[PDB]
Write a protein that binds this ligand. Structure first.
Ligand SMILES: C[C@@H]1O[C@@H](O[C@@H]2[C@@H](O[C@H]3O[C@H](CO)[C@H](O)[C@H](O)[C@H]3O)[C@@H](O)[C@@H](CO)O[C@H]2O)[C@@H](O)[C@H](O)[C@@H]1O
Ligand SMILES: [Ca+2]
Length: 171
């Protein structure tokens, strides 16, 4: 097998919750700074509280949901890894900001991972990053990353940090 970063693949589609649709889901940057062509790396609060920066990943704004879809048909994907959280670059100006209800990993229409099971009340700016390390079913065709904003999209700078597939075949 080999490991391939999601950000080194093209998606089928990638939607977000930002009002400005000319902005786009970001490879290897958080959403807002990336769309501003800034060098700011993706960064997250880890399990111990420390801040880690990541070279690779995806940056979105949660939506209803915002969905990033990959065609993995024939690729022999056996594993998905990512950290999930709200990028440090977000601004938690009040309790309405940086509040994400859940993030799911969906394969061929089945939720195979959801933050709702550990985090029924969702993610906030100070929730520690969630380490997702997940088997992917044989012969899978579609994998989707879905982030749900809830009431508002404000400050919902969701990053899939270090997001990578392990795969036996090609894409
Ligand atoms: C000028 C306008 O600014 C941004 O929209 C804001 C919105 O911004 C926050 O939430 C978005 C996600 O919706 C991003 O995380 C931003 O980085 C945040 O600052 C809020 O502050 C609301 C409050 O009413 O106002 C909007 O104008 C940006 O998203 C838009 O694309 C646009 O650039
Ligand atoms: Ca929200």
């Amino acid at each position: 097998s080999r490991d391939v970063y999601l950000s080194d693949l093209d998606w089928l589609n990638a939607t977000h919750g930002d009002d400005t649709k000319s902005k786009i889901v970001q490879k290897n940057h958080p959403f807002t700074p990336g769309n501003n062509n800034q060098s700011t790396k993706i960064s997250l609060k880890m399990e111990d509280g420390s801040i880690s920066e990541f070279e690779k990943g995806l940056g979105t704004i949660a939506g209803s949901p915002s969905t990033i879809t990959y065609d993995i048909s024939g690729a022999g994907v056996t594993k998905f890894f990512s950290y999930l959280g709200i990028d440090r670059s977000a601004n938690p100006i009040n309790e309405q900001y940086a509040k994400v209800d859940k993030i799911e990993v969906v394969v061929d229409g089945k939720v195979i991972y959801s933050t709702i099971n550990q985090f029924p009340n969702g993610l906030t700016y100070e929730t520690p990053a969630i380490k997702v390390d997940l088997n992917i079913p044989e012969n899978a065709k579609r994998l989707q990353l879905k982030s749900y904003a809830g009431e508002k999209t404000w400050g919902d700078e969701v990053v899939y940090a270090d997001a990578k597939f392990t795969a036996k075949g090609d894409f």
